[PDB]
Amino acid sequence: RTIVVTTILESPYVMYKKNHEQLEGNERYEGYCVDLAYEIAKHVRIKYKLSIVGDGKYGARDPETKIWNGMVGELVYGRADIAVAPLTITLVREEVIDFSKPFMSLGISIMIKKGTPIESAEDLAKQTEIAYGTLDSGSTKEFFRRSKIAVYEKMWSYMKSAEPSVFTKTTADGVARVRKSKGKFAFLLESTMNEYIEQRKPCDTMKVGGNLDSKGYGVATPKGSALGTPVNLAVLKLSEQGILDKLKNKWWYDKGEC
Ligand SMILES: N[C@@H](CCC(=O)O)C(=O)O
Numbered sequence: 001r002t003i004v005v006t007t008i009l010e011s012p013y014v015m016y017k018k019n020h021e022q023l024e025g026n027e028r029y030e031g032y033c034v035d036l037a038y039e040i041a042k043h044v045r046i047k048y049k050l051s052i053v054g055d056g057k058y059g060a061r062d063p064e065t066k067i068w069n070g071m072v073g074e075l076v077y078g079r080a081d082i083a084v085a086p087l088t089i090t091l092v093r094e095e096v097i098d099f100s101k102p103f104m105s106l107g108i109s110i111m112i113k114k115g116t117p118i119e120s121a122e123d124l125a126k127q128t129e130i131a132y133g134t135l136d137s138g139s140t141k142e143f144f145r146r147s148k149i150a151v152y153e154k155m156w157s158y159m160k161s162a163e164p165s166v167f168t169k170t171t172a173d174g175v176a177r178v179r180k181s182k183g184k185f186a187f188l189l190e191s192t193m194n195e196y197i198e199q200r201k202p203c204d205t206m207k208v209g210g211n212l213d214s215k216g217y218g219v220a221t222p223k224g225s226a227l228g229t230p231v232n233l234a235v236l237k238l239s240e241q242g243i244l245d246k247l248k249n250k251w252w253y254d255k256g257e258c
């Protein structure tokens with residue numbers, strides 16, 4: 001009866017509450033997706049348990065083993081019933097799991113340490129003094145790997161062979177690297193994460209230029225799952241009732257600091 005909700009520790013979607021070590025189950029976490037899961041469960045009328053994905057990855061298929069990892073994998077192999085996280089709706093994922101309509105709209109963006117002489121993707125691509133990377137094994141890395149647009153093809157060419165590696169295991173590592181590189185490192189991440197970090201102390205980063213693409217995050221369920229329909233309708237109702245807007249403001253700006 002209790003459905004398993006796989007998710008990921010990514011701020012401000014899912015974070016450990018101040019005194020998580022003193023708590024258990026769902027009470028250990030807080031964040032946009034923790035609230036979203038609560039609201040969805042309320043409309044779908046289900047009991048659930050949040051589960052942080054073991055490998056801490058979003059989801060990608062190994063070209064060799066063909067095995068899916070991350071949250072996508074938890075769904076594909078039946079270990080999770082639903083995924084409530086900033087999981088990007090992509091073609092390859094849509095082929096193996098189901099997605100609700102978007103609960104958040106975003107695009108790939110550029111994060112720089114304030115003062116960095118960069119204003120666009122073209123600016124990064126035409127130079128090598130400033131290094132740049134992305135989260136490893138996510139939709140952003142795939143974007144550059146698959147792009148047929150000149151400027152992005154140039155960027156992938158650089159990152160693909162960059163040494164040391166410019167692909168971080170977590171968004172947090174990417175941000176830390178930007179903050180510690182004195183402006184010699186820029187990070188490619190989704191606007192949502194970018195906008196959030198920009199509102200947090202030391203307030204030393206900022207999003208520059210427009211987004212590289214336009215897409216969205218969706219709540220995922222195993223392909224053909226009976227929860228897909230109810231979850232989709234729940235997402236649309238939350239959207240139309242302004243709750244998604246309320247949650248975004250709550251976790252991004254109301255708790256602003258810059
Ligand atoms: N939202 C992305 C992860 C973040 C990123 O790749 O920038 C995904 O679902 O893979």
Ligand SMILES: [Zn+2]
Nearest residue numbers: 016018020021
């Ligand atoms: Zn702790």
